[PDB]
mmCIF file of N, CA and C in Angstrom:
data_model
loop_
_atom_site.group_PDB
_atom_site.id
_atom_site.type_symbol
_atom_site.label_atom_id
_atom_site.label_comp_id
_atom_site.label_asym_id
_atom_site.label_seq_id
_atom_site.Cartn_x
_atom_site.Cartn_y
_atom_site.Cartn_z
ATOM 1 N N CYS A 16 144.066 182.969 292.486
ATOM 2 C CA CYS A 16 145.380 182.349 292.284
ATOM 3 C C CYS A 16 145.535 181.129 293.235
ATOM 4 N N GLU A 17 146.660 180.412 293.129
ATOM 5 C CA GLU A 17 147.146 179.557 294.218
ATOM 6 C C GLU A 17 148.398 180.176 294.875
ATOM 7 N N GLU A 18 148.474 180.015 296.201
ATOM 8 C CA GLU A 18 149.394 180.690 297.126
ATOM 9 C C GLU A 18 150.700 179.843 297.360
ATOM 10 N N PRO A 19 151.638 180.178 298.281
ATOM 11 C CA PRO A 19 152.994 179.616 298.333
ATOM 12 C C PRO A 19 153.153 178.080 298.242
ATOM 13 N N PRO A 20 152.580 177.334 299.191
ATOM 14 C CA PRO A 20 151.474 176.447 298.805
ATOM 15 C C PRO A 20 150.096 177.102 298.843
ATOM 16 N N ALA A 21 149.152 176.438 298.174
ATOM 17 C CA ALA A 21 147.714 176.711 298.231
ATOM 18 C C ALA A 21 147.151 176.528 299.685
ATOM 19 N N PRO A 22 145.816 176.593 299.903
ATOM 20 C CA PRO A 22 145.196 176.255 301.207
ATOM 21 C C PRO A 22 145.475 174.818 301.706
ATOM 22 N N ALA A 23 144.536 174.157 302.404
ATOM 23 C CA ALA A 23 144.866 172.960 303.209
ATOM 24 C C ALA A 23 144.388 171.552 302.707
ATOM 25 N N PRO A 24 143.347 171.393 301.831
ATOM 26 C CA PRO A 24 142.895 170.054 301.402
ATOM 27 C C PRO A 24 143.426 169.359 300.101
ATOM 28 N N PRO A 25 144.513 169.744 299.394
ATOM 29 C CA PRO A 25 145.501 170.765 299.690
ATOM 30 C C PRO A 25 145.289 172.174 299.091
ATOM 31 N N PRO A 26 144.158 172.600 298.486
ATOM 32 C CA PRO A 26 143.023 171.932 297.819
ATOM 33 C C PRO A 26 143.404 171.160 296.542
ATOM 34 N N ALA A 27 142.480 170.309 296.098
ATOM 35 C CA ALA A 27 142.189 170.181 294.671
ATOM 36 C C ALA A 27 143.208 169.280 293.982
ATOM 37 N N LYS A 28 144.262 168.917 294.712
ATOM 38 C CA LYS A 28 145.328 168.098 294.153
ATOM 39 C C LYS A 28 144.822 166.696 293.812
ATOM 40 N N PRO A 29 143.602 166.394 294.238
ATOM 41 C CA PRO A 29 142.927 165.157 293.829
ATOM 42 C C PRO A 29 142.631 165.151 292.329
ATOM 43 N N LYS A 30 142.752 166.306 291.693
ATOM 44 C CA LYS A 30 142.658 166.392 290.240
ATOM 45 C C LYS A 30 144.042 166.440 289.602
ATOM 46 N N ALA A 31 144.854 167.401 290.032
ATOM 47 C CA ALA A 31 146.242 167.483 289.596
ATOM 48 C C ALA A 31 146.980 166.173 289.838
ATOM 49 N N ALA A 32 147.195 165.854 291.105
ATOM 50 C CA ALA A 32 147.859 164.604 291.482
ATOM 51 C C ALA A 32 146.862 163.457 291.557
ATOM 52 N N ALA A 33 146.031 163.324 290.533
ATOM 53 C CA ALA A 33 145.401 162.048 290.212
ATOM 54 C C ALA A 33 145.214 161.888 288.708
ATOM 55 N N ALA A 34 145.315 163.001 287.983
ATOM 56 C CA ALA A 34 145.513 162.961 286.535
ATOM 57 C C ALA A 34 146.993 163.035 286.183
ATOM 58 N N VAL A 35 147.805 163.480 287.135
ATOM 59 C CA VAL A 35 149.184 163.014 287.246
ATOM 60 C C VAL A 35 149.250 161.603 287.830
ATOM 61 N N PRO A 36 149.914 161.473 288.970
ATOM 62 C CA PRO A 36 151.075 160.585 289.088
ATOM 63 C C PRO A 36 150.905 159.318 288.256
ATOM 64 N N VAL A 37 150.844 159.473 286.937
ATOM 65 C CA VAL A 37 151.984 159.963 286.173
ATOM 66 C C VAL A 37 152.146 159.194 284.865
ATOM 67 N N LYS A 38 152.724 157.996 284.964
ATOM 68 C CA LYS A 38 152.510 157.132 286.116
ATOM 69 C C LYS A 38 153.793 156.962 286.926
ATOM 70 N N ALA A 39 154.540 158.053 287.071
ATOM 71 C CA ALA A 39 155.994 157.979 287.146
ATOM 72 C C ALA A 39 156.548 156.960 286.157
ATOM 73 N N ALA A 40 156.266 155.688 286.398
ATOM 74 C CA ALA A 40 157.313 154.686 286.537
ATOM 75 C C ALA A 40 157.980 154.767 287.912
ATOM 76 N N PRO A 41 158.895 155.724 288.055
ATOM 77 C CA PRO A 41 159.784 156.115 286.957
ATOM 78 C C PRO A 41 160.718 154.976 286.554
ATOM 79 N N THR A 42 161.094 154.937 285.282
ATOM 80 C CA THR A 42 161.749 153.773 284.704
ATOM 81 C C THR A 42 163.258 153.829 284.915
ATOM 82 N N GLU A 43 163.697 153.480 286.124
ATOM 83 C CA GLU A 43 165.121 153.433 286.440
ATOM 84 C C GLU A 43 165.809 152.284 285.711
ATOM 85 N N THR A 44 165.673 152.264 284.385
ATOM 86 C CA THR A 44 165.730 151.005 283.625
ATOM 87 C C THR A 44 166.719 151.038 282.431
ATOM 88 N N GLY A 45 166.222 151.448 281.253
ATOM 89 C CA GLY A 45 166.563 150.806 279.974
ATOM 90 C C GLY A 45 167.861 151.293 279.339
ATOM 91 N N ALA A 46 169.000 150.969 279.967
ATOM 92 C CA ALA A 46 170.281 151.628 279.794
ATOM 93 C C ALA A 46 171.162 150.946 278.720
ATOM 94 N N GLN A 47 172.416 150.630 279.043
ATOM 95 C CA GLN A 47 173.459 150.172 278.109
ATOM 96 C C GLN A 47 173.906 148.751 278.426
ATOM 97 N N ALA A 48 174.156 147.949 277.385
ATOM 98 C CA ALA A 48 174.499 146.531 277.508
ATOM 99 C C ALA A 48 176.016 146.294 277.437
ATOM 100 N N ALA A 49 176.527 145.465 278.342
ATOM 101 C CA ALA A 49 177.572 144.503 278.004
ATOM 102 C C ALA A 49 177.190 143.689 276.771
ATOM 103 N N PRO A 50 176.017 143.066 276.820
ATOM 104 C CA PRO A 50 175.638 142.053 275.830
ATOM 105 C C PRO A 50 176.117 140.662 276.221
ATOM 106 N N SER A 51 176.225 139.767 275.244
ATOM 107 C CA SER A 51 176.751 138.431 275.480
ATOM 108 C C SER A 51 176.748 137.601 274.200
ATOM 109 N N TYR A 52 177.177 136.347 274.314
ATOM 110 C CA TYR A 52 177.985 135.725 273.271
ATOM 111 C C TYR A 52 178.032 134.206 273.453
ATOM 112 N N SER A 53 178.112 133.492 272.334
ATOM 113 C CA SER A 53 178.323 132.047 272.369
ATOM 114 C C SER A 53 179.775 131.695 272.058
ATOM 115 N N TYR A 54 180.047 130.398 271.918
ATOM 116 C CA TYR A 54 181.406 129.888 272.026
ATOM 117 C C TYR A 54 181.642 128.732 271.060
ATOM 118 N N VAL A 55 182.906 128.354 270.893
ATOM 119 C CA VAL A 55 183.309 127.511 269.773
ATOM 120 C C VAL A 55 184.637 126.820 270.060
ATOM 121 N N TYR A 56 184.960 125.809 269.257
ATOM 122 C CA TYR A 56 184.044 124.704 269.010
ATOM 123 C C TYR A 56 184.804 123.420 268.692
ATOM 124 N N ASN A 57 184.176 122.544 267.915
ATOM 125 C CA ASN A 57 184.099 121.124 268.266
ATOM 126 C C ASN A 57 184.791 120.242 267.232
ATOM 127 N N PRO A 58 186.116 120.174 267.312
ATOM 128 C CA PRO A 58 186.877 119.131 266.617
ATOM 129 C C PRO A 58 188.305 119.027 267.139
ATOM 130 N N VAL A 59 188.826 117.803 267.215
ATOM 131 C CA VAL A 59 190.067 117.457 266.533
ATOM 132 C C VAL A 59 189.792 116.695 265.239
ATOM 133 N N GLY A 60 190.590 116.967 264.215
ATOM 134 C CA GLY A 60 190.393 116.363 262.908
ATOM 135 C C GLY A 60 190.664 114.873 262.915
ATOM 136 N N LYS A 61 190.309 114.203 261.824
ATOM 137 C CA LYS A 61 190.826 112.870 261.540
ATOM 138 C C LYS A 61 191.661 112.864 260.263
ATOM 139 N N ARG A 62 192.567 111.897 260.159
ATOM 140 C CA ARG A 62 193.293 111.656 258.920
ATOM 141 C C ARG A 62 192.837 110.361 258.255
ATOM 142 N N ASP A 63 192.345 110.479 257.022
ATOM 143 C CA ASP A 63 192.720 109.552 255.961
ATOM 144 C C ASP A 63 193.633 110.230 254.940
ATOM 145 N N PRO A 64 193.037 111.023 254.048
ATOM 146 C CA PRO A 64 193.621 112.302 253.644
ATOM 147 C C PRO A 64 193.589 113.320 254.779
ATOM 148 N N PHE A 65 194.567 114.225 254.796
ATOM 149 C CA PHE A 65 195.206 114.692 253.573
ATOM 150 C C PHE A 65 196.674 114.231 253.485
ATOM 151 N N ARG A 66 197.122 113.225 254.278
ATOM 152 C CA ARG A 66 198.541 112.806 254.227
ATOM 153 C C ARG A 66 198.919 112.211 252.876
ATOM 154 N N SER A 67 198.309 111.123 252.445
ATOM 155 C CA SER A 67 198.568 110.568 251.107
ATOM 156 C C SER A 67 198.413 111.567 249.926
ATOM 157 N N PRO A 68 197.313 112.355 249.824
ATOM 158 C CA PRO A 68 197.161 113.296 248.729
ATOM 159 C C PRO A 68 198.054 114.557 248.762
ATOM 160 N N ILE A 69 199.000 114.727 249.708
ATOM 161 C CA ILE A 69 200.052 115.749 249.606
ATOM 162 C C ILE A 69 201.433 115.224 250.087
ATOM 163 N N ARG B 17 198.829 152.591 273.782
ATOM 164 C CA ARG B 17 198.355 152.669 275.156
ATOM 165 C C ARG B 17 196.947 152.102 275.325
ATOM 166 N N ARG B 18 196.467 151.309 274.367
ATOM 167 C CA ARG B 18 195.135 150.726 274.494
ATOM 168 C C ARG B 18 195.226 149.231 274.203
ATOM 169 N N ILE B 19 194.098 148.547 274.388
ATOM 170 C CA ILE B 19 194.062 147.093 274.546
ATOM 171 C C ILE B 19 193.849 146.418 273.193
ATOM 172 N N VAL B 20 194.720 146.714 272.232
ATOM 173 C CA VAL B 20 194.568 146.153 270.892
ATOM 174 C C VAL B 20 195.579 145.024 270.716
ATOM 175 N N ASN B 21 195.239 143.842 271.228
ATOM 176 C CA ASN B 21 196.150 142.707 271.146
ATOM 177 C C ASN B 21 196.121 142.077 269.761
ATOM 178 N N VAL B 22 197.134 142.388 268.948
ATOM 179 C CA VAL B 22 197.225 141.844 267.598
ATOM 180 C C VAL B 22 197.669 140.389 267.670
ATOM 181 N N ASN B 23 197.012 139.527 266.896
ATOM 182 C CA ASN B 23 197.325 138.103 266.941
ATOM 183 C C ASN B 23 197.620 137.547 265.552
ATOM 184 N N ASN B 24 196.622 136.938 264.921
ATOM 185 C CA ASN B 24 196.838 136.199 263.684
ATOM 186 C C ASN B 24 196.993 137.161 262.515
ATOM 187 N N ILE B 25 198.159 137.108 261.866
ATOM 188 C CA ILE B 25 198.555 138.051 260.827
ATOM 189 C C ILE B 25 198.618 137.330 259.493
ATOM 190 N N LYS B 26 198.395 138.076 258.414
ATOM 191 C CA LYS B 26 198.642 137.550 257.080
ATOM 192 C C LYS B 26 198.924 138.703 256.138
ATOM 193 N N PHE B 27 199.591 138.415 255.018
ATOM 194 C CA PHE B 27 199.772 139.392 253.952
ATOM 195 C C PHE B 27 200.291 138.683 252.712
ATOM 196 N N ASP B 28 200.088 139.322 251.557
ATOM 197 C CA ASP B 28 200.388 138.720 250.267
ATOM 198 C C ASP B 28 200.553 139.831 249.248
ATOM 199 N N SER B 29 200.990 139.459 248.047
ATOM 200 C CA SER B 29 201.292 140.426 247.000
ATOM 201 C C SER B 29 200.018 140.726 246.212
ATOM 202 N N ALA B 30 199.556 141.982 246.269
ATOM 203 C CA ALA B 30 198.225 142.318 245.768
ATOM 204 C C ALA B 30 198.160 142.431 244.252
ATOM 205 N N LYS B 31 199.298 142.446 243.561
ATOM 206 C CA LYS B 31 199.328 142.643 242.112
ATOM 207 C C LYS B 31 199.265 141.290 241.411
ATOM 208 N N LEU B 32 198.165 141.050 240.692
ATOM 209 C CA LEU B 32 198.019 139.837 239.887
ATOM 210 C C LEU B 32 199.273 139.541 239.077
ATOM 211 N N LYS B 33 199.495 140.324 238.031
ATOM 212 C CA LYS B 33 200.619 140.126 237.136
ATOM 213 C C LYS B 33 201.963 140.273 237.842
ATOM 214 N N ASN B 34 201.987 140.875 239.033
ATOM 215 C CA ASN B 34 203.233 141.158 239.737
ATOM 216 C C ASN B 34 204.132 142.015 238.857
ATOM 217 N N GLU B 35 203.771 143.287 238.693
ATOM 218 C CA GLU B 35 204.579 144.235 237.940
ATOM 219 C C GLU B 35 205.159 145.335 238.821
ATOM 220 N N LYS B 36 204.695 145.455 240.061
ATOM 221 C CA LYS B 36 205.279 146.359 241.040
ATOM 222 C C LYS B 36 205.104 145.767 242.427
ATOM 223 N N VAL B 37 206.025 146.113 243.331
ATOM 224 C CA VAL B 37 205.933 145.601 244.693
ATOM 225 C C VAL B 37 204.739 146.235 245.391
ATOM 226 N N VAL B 38 203.955 145.403 246.075
ATOM 227 C CA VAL B 38 202.827 145.858 246.881
ATOM 228 C C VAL B 38 202.310 144.671 247.694
ATOM 229 N N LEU B 39 202.105 144.883 248.989
ATOM 230 C CA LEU B 39 201.667 143.833 249.901
ATOM 231 C C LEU B 39 200.377 144.266 250.581
ATOM 232 N N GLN B 40 199.277 143.614 250.215
ATOM 233 C CA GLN B 40 198.060 143.696 251.007
ATOM 234 C C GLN B 40 198.241 142.882 252.285
ATOM 235 N N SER B 41 197.844 143.467 253.403
ATOM 236 C CA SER B 41 198.049 142.895 254.722
ATOM 237 C C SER B 41 196.744 142.926 255.498
ATOM 238 N N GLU B 42 196.447 141.810 256.169
ATOM 239 C CA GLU B 42 195.236 141.670 256.969
ATOM 240 C C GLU B 42 195.681 141.184 258.341
ATOM 241 N N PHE B 43 195.591 142.076 259.326
ATOM 242 C CA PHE B 43 195.948 141.791 260.707
ATOM 243 C C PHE B 43 194.677 141.715 261.540
ATOM 244 N N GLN B 44 194.649 140.785 262.489
ATOM 245 C CA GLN B 44 193.529 140.648 263.404
ATOM 246 C C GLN B 44 193.969 141.125 264.779
ATOM 247 N N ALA B 45 193.200 142.032 265.370
ATOM 248 C CA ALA B 45 193.559 142.618 266.651
ATOM 249 C C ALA B 45 192.291 142.938 267.429
ATOM 250 N N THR B 46 192.278 142.595 268.714
ATOM 251 C CA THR B 46 191.048 142.574 269.499
ATOM 252 C C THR B 46 191.220 143.301 270.826
ATOM 253 N N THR B 47 190.131 143.898 271.319
ATOM 254 C CA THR B 47 190.093 144.458 272.667
ATOM 255 C C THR B 47 188.968 143.814 273.466
ATOM 256 N N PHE B 48 189.073 143.892 274.800
ATOM 257 C CA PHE B 48 188.282 143.030 275.677
ATOM 258 C C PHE B 48 187.316 143.807 276.567
ATOM 259 N N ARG B 49 186.146 144.175 276.037
ATOM 260 C CA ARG B 49 185.118 144.860 276.817
ATOM 261 C C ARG B 49 184.645 143.952 277.950
ATOM 262 N N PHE B 50 183.851 144.486 278.878
ATOM 263 C CA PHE B 50 183.287 143.659 279.931
ATOM 264 C C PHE B 50 182.088 142.886 279.398
ATOM 265 N N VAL B 51 181.507 142.017 280.227
ATOM 266 C CA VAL B 51 180.441 141.142 279.758
ATOM 267 C C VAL B 51 179.123 141.899 279.557
#
């Protein structure tokens, strides 16, 4: 078996904790967005029409 | 009790022939999430 911990080198964790870690990451990452946005926009009108045609 | 700021409103009579009273209404109302 292995004991409370195991023996001292530690043993053997060079297999466990080398075919592990992992690769962790760990990815403290890919969560939720505000997002974002563009804006508008670009005129004051001109008159020829529509004054005469109404 | 929530952030539904109603702004530009419109409505009109939904019946073509106009044989009964009925008003279709389209209201615009917005809330302001963070960025």
